[PDB]
Amino acid sequence: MREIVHLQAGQCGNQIGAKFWEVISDEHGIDPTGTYHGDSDLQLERINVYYNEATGGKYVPRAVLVDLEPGTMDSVRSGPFGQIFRPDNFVFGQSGAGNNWAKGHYTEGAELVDSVLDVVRKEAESCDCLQGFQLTHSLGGGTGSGMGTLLISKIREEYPDRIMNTFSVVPSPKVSDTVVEPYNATLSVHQLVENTDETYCIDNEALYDICFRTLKLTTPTYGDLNHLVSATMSGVTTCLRFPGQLNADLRKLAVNMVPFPRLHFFMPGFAPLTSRGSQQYRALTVPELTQQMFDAKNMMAACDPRHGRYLTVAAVFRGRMSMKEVDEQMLNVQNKNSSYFVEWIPNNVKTAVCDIPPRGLKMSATFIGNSTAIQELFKRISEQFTAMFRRKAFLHWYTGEGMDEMEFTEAESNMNDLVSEYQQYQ
Amino acid sequence: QFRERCEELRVELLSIHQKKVCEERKAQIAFNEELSRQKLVEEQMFSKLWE
Amino acid sequence: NSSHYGEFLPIPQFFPCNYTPKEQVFSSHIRATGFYQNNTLNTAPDRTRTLDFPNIQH
Amino acid sequence: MRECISIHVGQAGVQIGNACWELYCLEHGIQPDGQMPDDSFNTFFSETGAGKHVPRAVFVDLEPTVIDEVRTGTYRQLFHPEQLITGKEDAANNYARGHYTIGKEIIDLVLDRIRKLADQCTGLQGFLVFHSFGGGTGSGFTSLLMERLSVDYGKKSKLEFSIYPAPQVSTAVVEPYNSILTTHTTLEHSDCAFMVDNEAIYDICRRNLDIERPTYTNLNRLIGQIVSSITASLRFDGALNVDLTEFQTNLVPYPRIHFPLATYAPVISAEKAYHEQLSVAEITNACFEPANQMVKCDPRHGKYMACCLLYRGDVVPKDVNAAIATIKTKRTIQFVDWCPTGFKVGINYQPPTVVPGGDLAKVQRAVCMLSNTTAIAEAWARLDHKFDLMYAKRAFVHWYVGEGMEEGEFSEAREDMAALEKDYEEVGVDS
Amino acid sequence: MRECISIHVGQAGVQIGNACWELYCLEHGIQPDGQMPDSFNTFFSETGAGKHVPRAVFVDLEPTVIDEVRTGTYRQLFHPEQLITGKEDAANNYARGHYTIGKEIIDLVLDRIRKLADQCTGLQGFLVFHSFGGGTGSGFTSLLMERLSVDYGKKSKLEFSIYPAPQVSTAVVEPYNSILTTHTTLEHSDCAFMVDNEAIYDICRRNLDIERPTYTNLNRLIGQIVSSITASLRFDGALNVDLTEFQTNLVPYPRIHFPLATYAPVISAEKAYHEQLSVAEITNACFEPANQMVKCDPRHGKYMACCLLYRGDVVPKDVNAAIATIKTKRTIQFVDWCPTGFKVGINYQPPTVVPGGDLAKVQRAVCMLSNTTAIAEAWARLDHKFDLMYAKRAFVHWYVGEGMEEGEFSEAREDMAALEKDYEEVGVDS
Amino acid sequence: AEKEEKRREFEAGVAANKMCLDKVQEVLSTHQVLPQNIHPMR
Ligand SMILES: Nc1nc2c(ncn2[C@@H]2O[C@H](COP(=O)(O)OP(=O)(O)OP(=O)(O)O)[C@@H](O)[C@H]2O)c(=O)[nH]1
Ligand SMILES: Nc1nc2c(ncn2[C@@H]2O[C@H](COP(=O)(O)OP(=O)(O)OP(=O)(O)O)[C@@H](O)[C@H]2O)c(=O)[nH]1
Ligand SMILES: Nc1nc2c(ncn2[C@@H]2O[C@H](COP(=O)(O)OP(=O)(O)O)[C@@H](O)[C@H]2O)c(=O)[nH]1
Ligand SMILES: [Mg+2]
Ligand SMILES: [Mg+2]
């Protein structure tokens, strides 16, 4: 009764969404030929959240994939589950942005978004009561970060009274996989602060840390990291399509998590993840989920909550599990730890319990926690953008494409606003 | 998809390529040796012309 | 000297084990045939966000 | 979809191109006839109905003895006969003759053939023009070649590979005169111009490849691997890919500074690949060695702006990001202060091929480099003094004056080069 | 995880490099072609083909010695880029190897050891072998010490040195080689050792029943000593010892880093048939000046520190039994300021004997490194020799012409004069 | 009945791990490479 249209922006959007459609079609028992192979009648009770009907007893996803290089697009279908998409949903340009945010926001993306919004209006019309949209992208490139912000502003003005989910991969400070990487991020968070209901901060540096320290993977390519990212996208919105003893859908957390409209940047982490050697040595209980859910090892961002104050906290659980013990452990960590939590917001943590677990596993837990320590991601990015822009480096590939010289000072002053607005809540 | 999901499979397909490259470079060594023999008989040829 | 670039005929030894092509036939088809275009009239059902067509009695 | 045109100009252009095209057929399963015994070939080859591929190359020259062994060689039948463009009489080491007198006779014929290859393409990604700064055809005829493509083709990428004259070993006398006059045209009429020196390749081929007696066969085999590294992201899939448009924007800080430096690693012999373990962290330390650079400029005197990296083979993103962390910690390697995120990473899947009769080995994993240092101020200041030394008494100027250009083009080109050196002083200095 | 980069310099260094690495091959069972038919990771490196390249760099200034290694039985085992050879040698001159010729190849090796150290995720300490007699082993080895201190700060640098003999010397300008390197190896050396050739000659004639030995039968004997030092780094024991440990419990002052090497038992295969080899009978043999490996007698001096390297079928039961009996005797003294002077290391694996060597099937062994005040006996003899030659301007014109001023002789002699006063105030009782 | 169900679930997990390891061994023993993945001269 509540549907979400899926958006994947750029290359990094395309590999994330490809693994995401596999992990929930297995969760819904759906083959890439398209039909239904299930053992429970409850799976098909709520499948309309993400799917549409097709002739022959088949279900197709509600996704459209925007891109600016067709080589990335055809790699998606050659993989695991590429035959489920309608080919009309694919849309792509001819000349890439070349990791230039201005080129993907003024010069190249401005012609593609007329064709993209032809298909977005079609998928949004087939629903009956549209819950919202969802976006996946990365703030380190040009296609995902440049046009990905423009597609937000095209649909937010059109559809104001909706919800709008965005997954942002904030560029890691230490890998430096792009030279203009601070230029791309600073002009994009400018559009994620004023135009977006919901935005998550996942860092590729922390995704390397979890796969190296906890999972003990010898060679974790980007296929295994997209197993990490898409396990959070299922657990956040599992309340929309599976019934529970205590449920909390997307708008219930969206109201409760943000105290002020500018502060919608969160840090996920997931709890039951363990190595194969150490899985047989540890039991699964309610305290075992929450002892690892709040460790700084399992944060999915390059921020440490010990340096700051937790503003508001969420935790969404999964499995058949007792919620005296859930609320017992939740009060316990608030009472021992008396400095990292804000004093003017008592009973900080929001909580939900879902009956249906991920397959092959007893219990699971997901985390969405807003802390003051988000500002170190924001302040240290602002310092590298000031190092570039003071001696006027690399701006000729952005200024000469139709964009003025005062736009950066608009974005830097707005970025300086948010690092101090987060400071006065500390 | 099982091969993509596994990792010890990736270890084995990493090792077999090196096991291939060993034989390829050994045959390259043999090729270089026969080229050296050709250069030697060229030198003997030009010495005979000088005589 | 210019013959040395092609004196030797190809040998199956002098080739890598892996060959990963880049196939773009379907993307070429989607570039050849455009990315949809709306000339239809607005045909949508009227809907209310709480209930669709209640049954009011008495 | 991704398509590119190669324009090999001069004898240095043709001989480099033959080394490039022998290796591209090996990479794509092409017989010397041109037929196969999967649209990877579309980037350089055009597909006909008969299952034949024709390269998108134009071999242009002003003397026939360089081009006829292409016409009667083993690869005599792959190339279309009208791609091989021949002039009637050569420029004879004259920048003026190739620009003013001789090059104006066949330039109209070239531009029609340049037109007849771009209309076939559904979308153009870039150009490749290969030239040497020593001779006249590679300097003078290449000079007005760019200005015709710059006016005719608006913003299409035109990459350049240059054979800059070696600092002490040179084959000519008017060779410094050619290099000064050609920088005036490669400044305002080029998108990116790569830099390789001859004398560095001789030192690498001796010490590392264990070759006591090199020839241009071994030198041009090394150069063709560099373009094969760049084009491998066009032709074969990677974990993350870098296009020609990609590193064009991410390497140059200013429009006047588009002269990177190349480095290939590993450069080892087949008897020593048995010995050394070849990994990801080992090969990237050999990219920063001033001994293994492909340009005779020492980057320890200068400060790095940015580095473009291209890894090929069996390489994972973690080993790259681990080895980048090792390089940045050391004090012997410096970066400019207004560019902390200096690096750029390219990863591909298909390992490099080995040519028959070549001198490398079968390598599982290699690495290229397109780095930009402030060490290229020293390579110009020595050429500035050599050109000033000859031009002080006005030697060899009557040949250039009496052929179409007046006396003062040297005086304005010297001040352009003197102003271009001061750009490197002001950008490189810490503030 | 533990790794150890070897460095060998000189014609002695290459000949002691080969004999040490020969028994290293039979200890781990690596064939001459580089392949087996994780103990070796401190000396060998890993390749995807399962090939093991040694972590050593031979350096020399003549082609006549490296070329025999390049065409020997182990021609494919050693890396060809690791055997750095010069073009013209210093020819028994410290100055030629220090100021003029040695500066040419100091740059290549310091790049070469960087490539092995970049392969080192953890490095225990460098080993250097050198001979004081030759110009390569004295001149370039002095700058090998000095640049290594700056390049790598506190990494361990152990040296096996070959001091000039008291009576039978291979060269005449050997005393000038000895004096001008001890000043360099004061402030640029972590730990040292000394072996003299007669002290090895006296063993093999008397104990090994070989009437006519060669450097083969010598260089195999130092190989038995170097193996036991790095033995516990390679194989576990009841309690082990690393390169860092036995260095710390031997040097009581930074100016004093000169122990004495000793090995026991050293017996023929015919004399291994008769004599029993217990734990007690091998520790008593390390105290004898007849079986000592330096021509100096500790009975004239005092032991300030001791170290022992047990190997084989040895238990802590018989270790503690013999040490008690040692301390009862009066012919062995200890300084009054070091009552607990002992350290004990115990290893499991017996030593491996090369086929064609000189020793036999042995089950128990010991290698002692006791620092004595009897090294000052040796320096008083050689400082007499350097004074007796430098008194009237002998062989000095060779050294001056390369570029070193004449005053460095008086610097390295008065530095040698202060070291005798440094070593005697340790030997006075409180 | 609760403790018996827990024992049953442990046995099922053990069987699943053994099955996945056996499938890993089988997919190692039989590797199939496409002709397009094969180089055309090869
Ligand atoms: N690196 C490299 N440089 C080459 C090669 N062949 C020629 N050159 C350069 O070319 C310069 C001389 O020019 P030519 O080889 O005669 O060709 P050109 O530049 O077109 O000059 P012209 O023959 O007069 O037309 C020399 O200084 C070389 O530096 C080559 O195979 N490799
Ligand atoms: N203990 C020991 N010393 C040796 C051995 N071989 C050579 N030496 C020493 O080496 C010294 C002579 O120098 P060499 O090793 O022959 O040559 P070098 O050290 O390279 O010096 P240059 O010849 O000048 O380059 C003599 O004084 C010996 O003490 C050996 O096998 N055992
Ligand atoms: N989490 C994650 N990040 C990725 C992946 N691939 C690339 N990235 C990040 O994306 C950034 C580059 O973005 P890019 O792929 O160019 O986005 P595009 O411009 O839309 O194509 C780099 O900084 C990488 O850190 C992936 O598989 N997972
Ligand atoms: Mg010519
Ligand atoms: Mg010698």
Describe the 3D structure.
This is part of a larger assembly, with one copy of chain A (426 residues), two copies of chain B, one copy of chain C (58 residues) and two copies of chain D. By secondary structure, chain A is an alpha/beta fold. In chain A, strand 10, helix 12 and strand 11 form a beta-alpha-beta unit. By secondary structure, chain B is mostly helical. Chain B starts with a helix and ends with a helix. Chain D is built from 14 helices and twelve strands. Chain D is 41% helix and 17% strand. Chain D has a six-stranded parallel beta sheet, sandwiched between helices. In chain D, helix 11 links the parallel strand 10 and strand 11. Chain D is of the alpha/beta class. In chain D, helix 1 crosses helix 8, helix 5 packs parallel to helix 6 and helix 12 packs antiparallel against helix 14. Chains in contact: A-B, A-C, A-D, B-C, B-D, B-F, C-D, C-F, D-E, D-F. At the A-D interface, helix 2 and helix 13 of A face helix 9, helix 11 and strand 11 of D. The site of one magnesium ion has 6 residues of chain D, from loops. Chain E: Its EC number is 3.6.5.-. Chain E: It is found in: Cytoplasm, Cytoskeleton; Cytoplasm, Cytoskeleton, Flagellum axoneme. Chain E: It catalyses: GTP + H2O = GDP + phosphate + H(+). Chain E: GO terms for molecular function: GTP binding; hydrolase activity; identical protein binding; metal ion binding; protein heterodimerization activity; protein-containing complex binding; structural constituent of cytoskeleton; structural molecule activity.
Tags for this entry?
part of a larger assembly, 6 chains, B: 51 residues, mainly alpha, 2 helices, 92% helix, D: 431 residues, alpha/beta, Rossmann fold, 60s Ribosomal Protein L30, Chain: A, Helix Hairpins, 6-stranded parallel beta sheet, 4-stranded mixed beta sheet, 14 helices, 41% helix, globular, binds guanosine-5'-triphosphate, binds guanosine-5'-diphosphate, binds magnesium ion
